[model samples]
Target: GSHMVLPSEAPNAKEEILGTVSWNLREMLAHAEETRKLMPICMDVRAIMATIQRKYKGIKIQEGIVDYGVRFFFYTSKEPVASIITKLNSLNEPLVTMPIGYVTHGFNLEEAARCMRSLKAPAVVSVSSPDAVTTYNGYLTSS
Candidate 1:
């Protein structure tokens, strides 16, 4: 592990410099948040977990925060179409890729629409071929 003190903790650090650094950090975080919002993939663990819970019953999900942001992995017997659509619909605006599946009992198309209307989370969706591959392989293999 690596440990280092912030410049603020350094002796005689200039207040103006620290203020500038803080401002820059805030700007960077805001930019990251915005970029994530604009993308069509779920880039964070929380969103992924919610997606899993909503879409795939009896699935296992694992996630963690990394240097970039949150990473996630999910495992289930079948693809979680409802959850994926639910998450996609929850975006503030329509996405380029919307999933399709045969309507089944207990399926709630309204919930998907409602999620789109009610959730205020950053826009994120999955954009991988055969979501199962991404869910199973993407988790453990990272460059």
Candidate 2:
């Protein structure tokens, strides 16, 4: 069988950076962590939005998928954002995180887009159905 993995459909083409997780350690520890490692660099941010929705409730979180990783915008404080990230990390979800460096208020759509440039071929995986299984495989390689 060919070892190469391919996407059956096109990516949602969107992307964030929050934090990182490693799934390799089922007592199989090969862990690593780094700052400034945003998430949307190669994955779809929408895939995880619902996870936030269920727990975070009514938060307008904007995601950016840059060449570096994923970054996010919060409608309110960054404290809860940090909380949600740890939840995902505890669940072994993959993303990177660190304490934010600065804060800005008000809507700046232009800046948002500039900060979160669309990823033409983002890793469009999800937590639902077929996509979820596919997502696991997508992640497996990284592990």
Candidate 3:
């Protein structure tokens, strides 16, 4: 029998981080506070998600059939990626984005590939040097 996997479980249950409604709300508030402190701009979750979705709206993934070794290739700059990375890093919760190299093995690679492919393109909100951008792209492909 084929079991249907939820989009949230596309990656390994143990390794993937899915933000729950409760958790995300808390994170949104926390980010709002942090951003207010770090910069004049205040970022809420809705704003962040909206921005992310818009940036990578066209990213696509072609899944592999068997082993499902997923690959994520982003044609984005370092600045926005870094910004998202920083905001996610500041979150003191369980639902934040995982580090770049974090891997969830023993799952459908195709689904994982889909998740990566759907991620937003790097935006200018986050500040990063050209070298950092190149390094992140390398990490995304290698992982």
Q: Candidate 1: minimum summed lDDT over ten consecutive residues — where? A: 15-24
Q: What are the per-residue Cα lDDT tens digits for candidate 2 across 1-143?
A: 33534443332423332222222211111111122222321112343455544433445554332221123323223333334334334334343321111123232323322222221222212222343344444433343
Separate clash counts for every candidate = 4, 20, 3
TM-scores for all candidates: the values are 0.21, 0.20, 0.18
> What lDDT does candidate 1 reach at residue 20?
10
lDDT of 1 by residue, 42-114 (tens): 3233543464344333444432222233112222324354454445444444222111221222233333333
CA lDDT of every candidate: 0.31, 0.29, 0.29
RMSD of 3: 17.9
User: Roughly what TM-score does model 2 have, to 2 decimal places?
Assistant: 0.20
Candidate 1: misplaced stretches above 4 Å? 4-34, 38-77, 81-83, 93-143
Q: Model 3 reaches what TM-score against the true structure?
A: 0.18
